[PDB]
Amino acid sequence: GLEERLPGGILLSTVETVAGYVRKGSLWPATFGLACCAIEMMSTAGPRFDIARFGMERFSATPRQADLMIVAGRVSQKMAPVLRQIYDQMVEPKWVLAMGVCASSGGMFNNYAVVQGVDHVVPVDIYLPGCPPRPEMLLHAILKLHDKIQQMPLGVNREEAIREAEQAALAVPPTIELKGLLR
Amino acid sequence: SAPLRILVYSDNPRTREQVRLALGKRIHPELPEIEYVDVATAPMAISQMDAGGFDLAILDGEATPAGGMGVAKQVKDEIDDCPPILVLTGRADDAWLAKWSRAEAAVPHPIDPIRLSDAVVSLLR
Amino acid sequence: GDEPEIIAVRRGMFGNRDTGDTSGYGRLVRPVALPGSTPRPYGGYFDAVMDRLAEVLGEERYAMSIERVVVYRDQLTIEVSRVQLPAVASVLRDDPDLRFELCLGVSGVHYPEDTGRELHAVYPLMSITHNRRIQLEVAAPDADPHIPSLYAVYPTTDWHERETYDFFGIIFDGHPSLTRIEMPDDWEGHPQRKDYPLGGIPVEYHGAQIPPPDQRRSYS
Amino acid sequence: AGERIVVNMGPQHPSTHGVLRLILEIEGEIITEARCGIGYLHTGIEKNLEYRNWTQGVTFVTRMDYLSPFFNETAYCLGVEKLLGITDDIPERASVIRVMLMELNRISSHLVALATGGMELGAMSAMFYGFREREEILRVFESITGLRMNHAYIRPGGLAADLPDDAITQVRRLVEILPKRLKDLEDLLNENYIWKARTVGVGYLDLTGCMALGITGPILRSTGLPHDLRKAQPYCGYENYEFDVITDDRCDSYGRYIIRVKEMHESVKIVEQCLARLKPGPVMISDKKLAWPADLKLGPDGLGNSPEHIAKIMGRSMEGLIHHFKLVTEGIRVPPGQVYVAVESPRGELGVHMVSDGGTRPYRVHYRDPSFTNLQAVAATCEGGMVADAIAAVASIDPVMGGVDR
Amino acid sequence: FLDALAGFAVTLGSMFKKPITEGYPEKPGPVAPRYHGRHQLNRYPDGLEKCIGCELCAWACPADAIYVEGADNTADERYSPGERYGRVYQINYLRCIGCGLCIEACPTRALTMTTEYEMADDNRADLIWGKDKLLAPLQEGMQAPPHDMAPGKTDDDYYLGNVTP
Amino acid sequence: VEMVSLTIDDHEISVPKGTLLIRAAELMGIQIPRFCDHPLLDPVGACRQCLVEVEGQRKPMASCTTTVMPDMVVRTQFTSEAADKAQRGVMELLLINHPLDCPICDKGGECPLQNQAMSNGRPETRFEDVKRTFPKPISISSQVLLDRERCVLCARCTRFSSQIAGDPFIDLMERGALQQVGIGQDK
Numbered sequence A: 001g002l003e004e005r006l007p008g009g010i011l012l013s014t015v016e017t018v019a020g021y022v023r024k025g026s027l028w029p030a031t032f033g034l035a036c037c038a039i040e041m042m043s044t045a046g047p048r049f050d051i052a053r054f055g056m057e058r059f060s061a062t063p064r065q066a067d068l069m070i071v072a073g074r075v076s077q078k079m080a081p082v083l084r085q086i087y088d089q090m091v092e093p094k095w096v097l098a099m100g101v102c103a104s105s106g107g108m109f110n111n112y113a114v115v116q117g118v119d120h121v122v123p124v125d126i127y128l129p130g131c132p133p134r135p136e137m138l139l140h141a142i143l144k145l146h147d148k149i150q151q152m153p154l155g156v157n158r159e160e161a162i163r164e165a166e167q168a169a170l171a172v173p174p175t176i177e178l179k180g181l182l183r
Numbered sequence B: 001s002a003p004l005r006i007l008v009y010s011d012n013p014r015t016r017e018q019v020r021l022a023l024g025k026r027i028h029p030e031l032p033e034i035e036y037v038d039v040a041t042a043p044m045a046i047s048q049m050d051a052g053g054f055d056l057a058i059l060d061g062e063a064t065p066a067g068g069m070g071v072a073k074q075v076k077d078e079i080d081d082c083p084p085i086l087v088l089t090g091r092a093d094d095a096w097l098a099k100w101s102r103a104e105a106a107v108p109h110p111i112d113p114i115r116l117s118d119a120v121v122s123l124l125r
Numbered sequence C: 001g002d003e004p005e006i007i008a009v010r011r012g013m014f015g016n017r018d019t020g021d022t023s024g025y026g027r028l029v030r031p032v033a034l035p036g037s038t039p040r041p042y043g044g045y046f047d048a049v050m051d052r053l054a055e056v057l058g059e060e061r062y063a064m065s066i067e068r069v070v071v072y073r074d075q076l077t078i079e080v081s082r083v084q085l086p087a088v089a090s091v092l093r094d095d096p097d098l099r100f101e102l103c104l105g106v107s108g109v110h111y112p113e114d115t116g117r118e119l120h121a122v123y124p125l126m127s128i129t130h131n132r133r134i135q136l137e138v139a140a141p142d143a144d145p146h147i148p149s150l151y152a153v154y155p156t157t158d159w160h161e162r163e164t165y166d167f168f169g170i171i172f173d174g175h176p177s178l179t180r181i182e183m184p185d186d187w188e189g190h191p192q193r194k195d196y197p198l199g200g201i202p203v204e205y206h207g208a209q210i211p212p213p214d215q216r217r218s219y220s
Numbered sequence D: 001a002g003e004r005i006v007v008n009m010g011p012q013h014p015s016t017h018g019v020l021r022l023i024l025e026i027e028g029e030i031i032t033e034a035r036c037g038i039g040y041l042h043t044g045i046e047k048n049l050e051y052r053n054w055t056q057g058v059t060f061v062t063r064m065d066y067l068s069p070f071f072n073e074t075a076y077c078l079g080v081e082k083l084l085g086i087t088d089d090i091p092e093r094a095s096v097i098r099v100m101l102m103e104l105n106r107i108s109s110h111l112v113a114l115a116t117g118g119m120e121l122g123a124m125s126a127m128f129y130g131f132r133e134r135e136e137i138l139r140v141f142e143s144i145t146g147l148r149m150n151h152a153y154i155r156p157g158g159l160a161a162d163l164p165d166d167a168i169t170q171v172r173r174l175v176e177i178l179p180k181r182l183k184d185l186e187d188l189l190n191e192n193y194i195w196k197a198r199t200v201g202v203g204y205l206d207l208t209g210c211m212a213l214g215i216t217g218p219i220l221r222s223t224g225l226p227h228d229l230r231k232a233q234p235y236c237g238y239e240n241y242e243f244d245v246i247t248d249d250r251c252d253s254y255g256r257y258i259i260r261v262k263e264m265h266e267s268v269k270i271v272e273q274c275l276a277r278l279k280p281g282p283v284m285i286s287d288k289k290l291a292w293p294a295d296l297k298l299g300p301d302g303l304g305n306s307p308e309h310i311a312k313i314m315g316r317s318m319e320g321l322i323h324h325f326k327l328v329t330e331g332i333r334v335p336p337g338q339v340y341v342a343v344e345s346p347r348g349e350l351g352v353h354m355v356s357d358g359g360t361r362p363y364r365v366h367y368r369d370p371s372f373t374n375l376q377a378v379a380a381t382c383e384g385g386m387v388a389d390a391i392a393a394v395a396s397i398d399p400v401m402g403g404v405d406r
Numbered sequence E: 001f002l003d004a005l006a007g008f009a010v011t012l013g014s015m016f017k018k019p020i021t022e023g024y025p026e027k028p029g030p031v032a033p034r035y036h037g038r039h040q041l042n043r044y045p046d047g048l049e050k051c052i053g054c055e056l057c058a059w060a061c062p063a064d065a066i067y068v069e070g071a072d073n074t075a076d077e078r079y080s081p082g083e084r085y086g087r088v089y090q091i092n093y094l095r096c097i098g099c100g101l102c103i104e105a106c107p108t109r110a111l112t113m114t115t116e117y118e119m120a121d122d123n124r125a126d127l128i129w130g131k132d133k134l135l136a137p138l139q140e141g142m143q144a145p146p147h148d149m150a151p152g153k154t155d156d157d158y159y160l161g162n163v164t165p
Numbered sequence F: 001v002e003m004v005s006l007t008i009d010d011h012e013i014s015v016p017k018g019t020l021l022i023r024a025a026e027l028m029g030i031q032i033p034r035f036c037d038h039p040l041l042d043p044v045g046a047c048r049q050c051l052v053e054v055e056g057q058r059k060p061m062a063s064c065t066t067t068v069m070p071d072m073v074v075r076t077q078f079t080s081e082a083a084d085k086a087q088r089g090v091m092e093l094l095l096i097n098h099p100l101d102c103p104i105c106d107k108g109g110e111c112p113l114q115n116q117a118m119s120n121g122r123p124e125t126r127f128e129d130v131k132r133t134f135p136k137p138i139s140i141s142s143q144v145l146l147d148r149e150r151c152v153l154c155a156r157c158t159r160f161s162s163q164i165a166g167d168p169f170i171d172l173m174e175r176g177a178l179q180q181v182g183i184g185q186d187k
């Protein structure tokens, strides 16, 4: 959008900060949930907690209105195409919260049927441990995503950030090479 | 001839090194020289694909923040006249998803140099 | 029949599936037999159920249909010979004294070491009227994994014959449409067969990874 | 013929629980054919069980039909114990706590069913009030087990640990407040004109249909048949409890909803009985060859094996150390055999076919989950009605897809 | 006849009752004392690590979420009483299911589970917590783990609880 | 080859003449606990763990040393209370001096002593006295560490180093409860 054509002066910085504040608030989750993690997501929406306090009570039934896709449960092989379709049918900017161990790495179900982490099919922004994560853990992960969204760049700043993140990522060794103290 | 440009996508630098080792400067002396563009992050890979000028993309299905199969589906849905996509699968059972990603070819981990080279030749031929 | 049904031959002490960690303990040979034919005075109402089934079915038909009778942990299993399954199922459902109207489903179990009887289908039946229950067991070889579908007798077996098929390849001949219900139709293999690998991936750690449990050593 | 659309209720839909796929041929907005698409939540739990020991597959089974964790755990543990021939050796306190937790879990699962059904049918505050009550129930569950869901608290031969000293008081408070707070939820729905109009006569299924599809639970008992596995084929000592099998004669969605609402009160009564009969004693079989050796206790460093158990195993008892090591690592060995054990889960007969090959791992564990069988009634309870009626019918079926796919 | 309107009387009533929401994150709610929070590797009062690296926690884990590598407690560098200590100890919290089988498995109580739960990261690797992140903080009276055992004490004394700062 | 009929427990089988009772039980699927027995080592009958009741014998017979004889009737721990009592008492005596080292023991999980104490041992200790102790571990070579406290003195190592390999550089040393596998000196 034209907000991405703005010059990199103070104008772009203020547009970025206001857009981040606006998007961190009103972060409507998609009406999407796979398993017991979906039950904990509902509990988070439930009175004991209040997802609504964060402007996130409107679980967008359609992906068009959804801004955040809380996977919230295990993703089977047959479901990955559906989850990717839902992700693609959301409109940018989009974010994916991998709620629970099943959504983030497959969790305990390390077998043929489970995808072993939704990042196999959709870009994940935050991983949320737990099986299921208790609602406070979900709110913590959501606030972490809010912090990430606030510092989200735009336009030329976005391009520079992408280049810098690429440069940093090209150098990190794989986890299999962090042999610290391994005999 | 035009140096065929290949996009190698993997958060794991060793997977990129293995892919570049299987495919030398020339897969065969009959084929053109090969230039490799290494991308570790999905945003960079997507932007490179949008810039175009690639003859093949090797996407690691095991890439941490964004899997190669997802990126393959995204590029074949978002880039017009996108190049053939080769996906590296972390397990045999991933084959189904490899088919879903519509990748022209799938090469299981660990990357067999010869299997990868043959698949690349088939895709470029 | 009439002999114990050995489903696996376990050799070596300590449940080693291979040569074994300590020398000299691998020479034991213990066949793993499931409970065999029960002596005739079955417990509780099982005696009445079997007597009624043998009365409704002719002596010849009963002998041809009922391959075995087992009473294990106060639960009655009837090894029903393949082919004859629909007839005995109809008798069980319709006979007023049996009246097993509620079939709870079909469960597949794979015995790769049970020659000629690798694939077993288990039919848990319950009679609400008599507050009774039993299980039928139908064995089929891995070579011809065909069983008569009970769709006409127990429509509830629909989707079960499918799940059991999807996960074992038992063909349940005569089923209206035996299509995969859990796995995708393009899926290759039947996951719950023992020969089908678990299909996991190594768990990633800093500097190391743990292979899936099916690859790592186990004792049974 | 050519004037009817075919649409996907699809996995991603508010009323389809995210993984259920109703494919509806709608002539205008009347459901003409209703195909059911399953497996979007298949998980390989049944196969993955086979590579873990007993007392470990518990953590697996509690995650299929995740709204009824204690029911899955109890079915699994009853199967294991029956294979062991240990069902009569389980401590009385363990059985009483099992019944108490199963009934509290029945209340919780019915609360989730009512919440999601009301949300699907527009009853927005129904979800919040149901989850407010479920919040107290889950507080009790967390205090007892340390987890809000997917508890692994019920273990082969008893429980994972004894109740905390405050557990009895919390459960008594639940017995006191649950009826009053369920009054709020019932007032929103029970006599509401819109709720009744939206569910009365919807999703009809006669007793013949229930038998033909093998339906069970509130759907079957909405036909007036008082079939309940707790009275018929009692388990965990349910025979010692005075409670009435809730059953209705409407055979429709509203009848099933009322059955669930009344089952909540029956569960409250059973929990009061459990508290009356709850007496101090062991919660795990006395046989040290099978008993779970762990002794969890709290301290300033958190929850962990009690210092007394540490002293016993690492300081003085070689036999104790060997038993702890083996029962924790390999686990018990279950004599070879087959056993089919059934319980009355909130959604109907939850059956478990358990086959042991004599090893330390379950050779085969199949769950006949009531939701899997009940979903076969979607065609009967949806064809002919409107899509709005299909939503109510499916919600009345109350399918938890974890149990459906497993 | 007013019974059909009972629901109204409910909601309106609740509109005047104080909301019951826990004030997380500003005022986090009280978790159960027994809650299955983050695993924690504990120390003896003198600072020695309790973990002997027996791998029983990892053995019992249904999700293979624990990786443990033992090593010898050489006199030059001792970390735990006895012959073995767990020098590498990693928990993959993206595989942990919080079941608690690990703590029930430990024969030393080296592994407990706290009530702390706030945990999440944008990176998969960052959620594989190593020994440094899991070890309990060094309390008052404790010493650096690489030190000899308490004077006139043996492993049995540590397990019997007869050690002091 | 001569073949002798035999009855183990209530079951009957026929085995080649000269077969050991433990081998016959193995072929029949009966698991008799054993430490010192080894199929490839000449039987020594030391640990006394493999005791069974034989008709016509007053004392329990070490199945690892008792050759099968025709018409012999043998009842293992599965069908003889005396045999079970003997085996469990032997296990208890085997465990009284054993170190509480299972978590740190390399053999843990793969230990025949653990498995046979589970299957043939008392659930808890009666031994409230002081355990016998040795300095542990001691190297007998560049490759092999020896933990004499865990040693059940089954002599399998020594019997191998003598019979199978002609390298008897380890032997049982000292006497009584102090007995230990050793190399004698720096050699």
Ligand SMILES: CC(C)=CCC/C(C)=C\CC/C(C)=C/CC/C(C)=C\CC/C(C)=C/CC/C(C)=C/CC/C(C)=C/CC/C(C)=C/CC/C(C)=C/CC1=C(C)C(=O)c2ccccc2C1=O
Pocket: A031, A032, A033, A034, A035, A038, A039, A041, A042, A045, A057, A058, A059, D013, D014, D015, D016, D017, D018, D019, D112, D116, D124, D127, D400, D401
């Ligand atoms: C042009 C311009 C800028 C002009 C200047 C002026 C200006 C700025 C604008 C003027 C004002 C405007 C137009 C403002 C824009 C905003 C606007 C118009 C409106 C949007 C905001 C809005 C409509 C607010 C109210 C919305 C509202 C009432 C929200 C509440 C919704 C609720 C109650 C949500 C809770 C839902 C919930 C419980 C979620 C869980 C979903 C789950 C769990 C999904 C998966 C799942 C399900 C669905 C189960 O039910 C289930 C059941 C059992 C087992 C498993 C599952 C399972 O897996």
Ligand code: SF4
Pocket: A034, A035, A036, A037, A072, A073, A074, A099, A100, A101, A102, A103, A107, A130, A131, A132, A133, D063, D066, D150, E097
């Ligand atoms: S992470 Fe745990 S709670 Fe979430 S879907 Fe997986 S098993 Fe269920």
Ligand code: SF4
Pocket: E050, E051, E052, E053, E054, E055, E056, E057, E058, E068, E086, E102, E105, E106, E107, E108, E109, E110, E111, F103
């Ligand atoms: S944490 Fe406990 S169980 Fe795990 S290695 Fe350390 S002492 Fe053993």
Ligand code: SF4
Pocket: E039, E057, E060, E061, E062, E063, E064, E065, E066, E091, E095, E096, E097, E098, E099, E100, E101, E102, E103
């Ligand atoms: S809580 Fe359970 S899954 Fe998590 S590390 Fe401990 S034993 Fe493993």
Ligand code: SF4
Pocket: F150, F151, F152, F153, F154, F155, F156, F157, F158, F181
């Ligand atoms: S060291 Fe030798 S005598 Fe001692 S237990 Fe081992 S094999 Fe037997």
Ligand code: FES
Pocket: F033, F034, F035, F036, F037, F044, F045, F046, F047, F048, F049, F050, F051, F062, F063, F064, F065
């Ligand atoms: S094994 Fe026969 S006496 Fe030791």
